[PDB]
Amino acid sequence: ERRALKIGVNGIPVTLEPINAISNVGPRIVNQIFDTLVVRDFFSNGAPGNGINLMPSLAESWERIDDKSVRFKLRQKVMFHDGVEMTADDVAYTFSSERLWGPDAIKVIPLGGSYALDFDEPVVEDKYTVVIRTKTPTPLTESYMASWMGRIVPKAYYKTLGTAAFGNKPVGTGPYKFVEFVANDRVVIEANDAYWGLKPTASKITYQLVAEPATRVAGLISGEYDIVTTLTPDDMALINSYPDLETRGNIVENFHMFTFNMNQPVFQSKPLRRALALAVNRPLIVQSLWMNKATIPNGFNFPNYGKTFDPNRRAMEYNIEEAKRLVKESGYDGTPITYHTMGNYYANAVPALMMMIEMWKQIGVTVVPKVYAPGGAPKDQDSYMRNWSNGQWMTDAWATMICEFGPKGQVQKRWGWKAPAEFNDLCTKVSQIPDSKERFDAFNRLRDIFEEEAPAVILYQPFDVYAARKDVHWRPIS
Numbered sequence: 001e002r003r004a005l006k007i008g009v010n011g012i013p014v015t016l017e018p019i020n021a022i023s024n025v026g027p028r029i030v031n032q033i034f035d036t037l038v039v040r041d042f043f044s045n046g047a048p049g050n051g052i053n054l055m056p057s058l059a060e061s062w063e064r065i066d067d068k069s070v071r072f073k074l075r076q077k078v079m080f081h082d083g084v085e086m087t088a089d090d091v092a093y094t095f096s097s098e099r100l101w102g103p104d105a106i107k108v109i110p111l112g113g114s115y116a117l118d119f120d121e122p123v124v125e126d127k128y129t130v131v132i133r134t135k136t137p138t139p140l141t142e143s144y145m146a147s148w149m150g151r152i153v154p155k156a157y158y159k160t161l162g163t164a165a166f167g168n169k170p171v172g173t174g175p176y177k178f179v180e181f182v183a184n185d186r187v188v189i190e191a192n193d194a195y196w197g198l199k200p201t202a203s204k205i206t207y208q209l210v211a212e213p214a215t216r217v218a219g220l221i222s223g224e225y226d227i228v229t230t231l232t233p234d235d236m237a238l239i240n241s242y243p244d245l246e247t248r249g250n251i252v253e254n255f256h257m258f259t260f261n262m263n264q265p266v267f268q269s270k271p272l273r274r275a276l277a278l279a280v281n282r283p284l285i286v287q288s289l290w291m292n293k294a295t296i297p298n299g300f301n302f303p304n305y306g307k308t309f310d311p312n313r314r315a316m317e318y319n320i321e322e323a324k325r326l327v328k329e330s331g332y333d334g335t336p337i338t339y340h341t342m343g344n345y346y347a348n349a350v351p352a353l354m355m356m357i358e359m360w361k362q363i364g365v366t367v368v369p370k371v372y373a374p375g376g377a378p379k380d381q382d383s384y385m386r387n388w389s390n391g392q393w394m395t396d397a398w399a400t401m402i403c404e405f406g407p408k409g410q411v412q413k414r415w416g417w418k419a420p421a422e423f424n425d426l427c428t429k430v431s432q433i434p435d436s437k438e439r440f441d442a443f444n445r446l447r448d449i450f451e452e453e454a455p456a457v458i459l460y461q462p463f464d465v466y467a468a469r470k471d472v473h474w475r476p477i478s
């Protein structure tokens with residue numbers, strides 16, 4: 001009745017510590033090991049999978065007390081996988097200064113600071129009651145707890161081991177418990193029948209790295225895998241021609257992009273970055289490799305932002321005439337520039353890059369592909385152009401414009417983007433004021449500056465496709 005599931009995946013996270021595993025490949029695993037206080041109802045308000053009403057999970061109930069404080073009443077007798085009961089101390093530790101948003105915490109969870117709300121120290125009222133607090137007002141606390149930043153960790157065990165060692169031997173409250181993790185190869189988790197919620201329906205799940213998508217499709221066809229991830233619309237006809245298999249595709253709240261190491265002199269200033277941005281013919285790429293199913297957004301602007309989504313925003317421009325003009329003004333001598341990609345970790349990463357190489361050749365820029373295997377990533381000093389993605393993880397434009405591209409983020413700090421002062425002042429301003437005409441117009445100014453500066457270039461939202469045996473009725477692939 002309960003089968004062992006074998007999942008062929010595009011990649012394996014570098015760790016299983018829930019925040020440091022935030023990526024396209026970590027959530028599908030950590031989502032089964034850990035739980036959150038609340039969860040989004042993906043089908044609320046008639047939504048076809050992207051609904052936002054919040055429902056109980058580790059917290060049975062919650063009340064916003066004021067514009068800075070939310071009280072959570074926790075479920076009782078919830079057990080971590082090692083048999084330690086979960087209490088308000090564990091939830092307080094999860095969002096503490098020590099673990100997440102303090103100065104020392106940023107050394108081991110490098111992105112904790114940039115992805116945190118403006119937290120103050122949680123208050124434990126009793127064994128099953130915790131108050132999550134912010135130093136300044138924010139309405140996002142509750143939805144933040146349903147996000148990939150809100151997975152609850154065990155205080156005693158986590159603090160003893162440290163963030164890094166915990167990541168190799170994680171302990172959570174989720175429906176599956178950790179078995180093994182082999183870097184760049186597999187993760188195995190097993191049913192936790194002590195789970196507080198619905199009993200797990202699989203006995204074990206193995207996430208196995210299968211780098212090439214054609215090999216994943218072939219493994220599903222042979223019965224080696226029950227489920228496979230990160231396919232494209234082109235694979236659908238063949239898979240659906242098998243009566244015992246099926247595919248599922250949808251536009252994800254994530255965008256593919258290319259970006260630059262702006263510590264490098266060739267990309268320290270905007271002209272050549274913007275030239276490469278203006279030479280990208282996105283409809284051609286979408287028509288050639290995505291069967292016109294991938295979506296091109298009107299800027300760094302997505303419907304899930306709600307009040308900060310601008311449905312009337314103009315399209316991102318394509319101007320080869322201006323791109324040629326900016327290549328010359330930059331003094332670009334013709335030196336080849338590398339573009340690093342971990343194979344097709346991103347669906348259509350290598351075929352899209354080859355099309356963009358030809359587009360860039362037509363504006364006088366020579367770009368060379370540098371394709372590497374998992375774990376063979378280059379040092380920052382050797383990275384020039386690279387591909388990336390950003391999952392739009394909040395119902396507010398704060399994510400990912402401010403958490404990734406703002407003054408506290410990795411694009412400015414690690415990757416050297418010298419953002420104009422107006423950009424960083426606007427990031428600061430929006431994080432103070434509530435939803436209004438002022439906030440809506442400020443995010444539009446940030447979007448305008450993003451396109452002028454080109455620290456990254458948005459390509460499209462992929463039409464994500466996965467496949468599975470029709471007799472596998474539960475697929476832990478998030």
Ligand SMILES: O=P(O)(O[C@@H]1[C@@H](O)[C@H](O)[C@@H](CO)O[C@@H]1O)O[C@@H]1[C@@H](O)[C@H](O)[C@@H](CO)O[C@@H]1O
Pocket residue numbers: 014022023024025377387388389390391392400404
């Ligand atoms: O798999 P990727 O695209 O990017 C991951 C990186 O996170 C990871 O460090 C790198 C090396 O292992 O491999 C991938 O490029 O995940 C991004 C996050 O990096 C990002 O924080 C989030 C929100 O913006 O969106 C996505 O989930």
